[PDB]
Structure formats: C-alpha cells, structure tokens
Amino acid sequence: RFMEPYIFGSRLDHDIIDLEQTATHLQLALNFTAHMAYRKGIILFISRNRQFSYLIENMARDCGEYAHTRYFRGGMLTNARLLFGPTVRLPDLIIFLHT
RNA sequence: AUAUACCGCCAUCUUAACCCUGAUGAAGGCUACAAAGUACGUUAGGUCAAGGUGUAGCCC
Ligand SMILES: [Mg+2]
Numbered sequence: 679r680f681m682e683p684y685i686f687g688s689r690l691d692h693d694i695i696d697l698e699q700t701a702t703h704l705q706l707a708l709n710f711t712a713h714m715a716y717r718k719g720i721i722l723f724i725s726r727n728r729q730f731s732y733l734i735e736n737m738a739r740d741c742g743e744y745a746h747t748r749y750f751r752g753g754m755l756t757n758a759r760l761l762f763g764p765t766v767r768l769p770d771l772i773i774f775l776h777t
Numbered sequence: 778a779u780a781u782a783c784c785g786c787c788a789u790c791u792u793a794a795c796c797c798u799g800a801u802g803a804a805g806g807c808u809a810c811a812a813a814g815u816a817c818g819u820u821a822g823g824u825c826a827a828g829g830u831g832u833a834g835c836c837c
Contacts, residue, residue, distance in 0.1 A: 728810070752806085752813025757796040759817065
C-alpha cells in the first residue's frame, strides 16, 4: 500500500514505477550519500539477493566502503559492542539495494 | 578375653551477561539457496594367618 504514491499505473496487471518521482528520490539519495562520503562516514551496503552478492561486494571494495550480502545474524547493529568489541564504530549510512 | 576396645583391611545398607519478539502480559527467540540470536554416615558384621596401639582377666 505505501508504494502506491510512487506507482504511475498498472500495465496489464504489471505495476509501472513513475520514473519522474524516482529521479527526484534518487537525486536526494545520491546527494545524501555523496555528502556522507565527503565527511568520511562509514557506508555499509546490504542486500540478500544472492544473484548480486559478488557484484555488490566488488563495488564496496572498489569505493572503499563496506558490504554485508550474507546472512544477517541477530544483533549486529543493536548488539554491536558485544559482537565486535566495546570500541567498535557503527556505520554512519546504510544503503539497501534490496530491502 | 576384648576389632561387643580402636585403628588396618573386606563386606551390608542409606544418601552469568547482552540483544530482539509479543502494542514493553504471563511468555518466547529456529530454517544454511538460513527468516534474531550471540556470548560421608551405618553395622551387638567378618577378619589379630603374612598389620599395628591399648584395655581388662588368673597368679596355693
Ligand atoms: Mg564385631
């Protein structure tokens, strides 16, 4: 339901995403990502689509950022201190290619 | 004579934290082609034959 305002219409029972809204949303998201990278924030890409795990890991390694395409264990973010150490720094921005 | 004196030795019997979910209820938390989970006494016991310490008996 919450995706309805972003849908241009249905073409033979297939939803079509309004690309005019996608352009503005992508502009805002890319501006935010660029500003965060300028401030040397830790950027973590996340995606459980196994068809693109290799590509996303390669991209994250290429841009000097971090990736998590594997099984997400309980408490990686909400219990990070116990799972990594008391002085671990969490990501400043998380990018979901697949939500 | 006494282990029905003790030991020695045999045998009997009794005997942590953290993180999520449920509207922050009792409560719950797993799937790998992965979906919240990680950190001693007891006995009128035997044995003084390969071991000891005492205790009492008798002494016309
Ligand atoms: Mg006896």
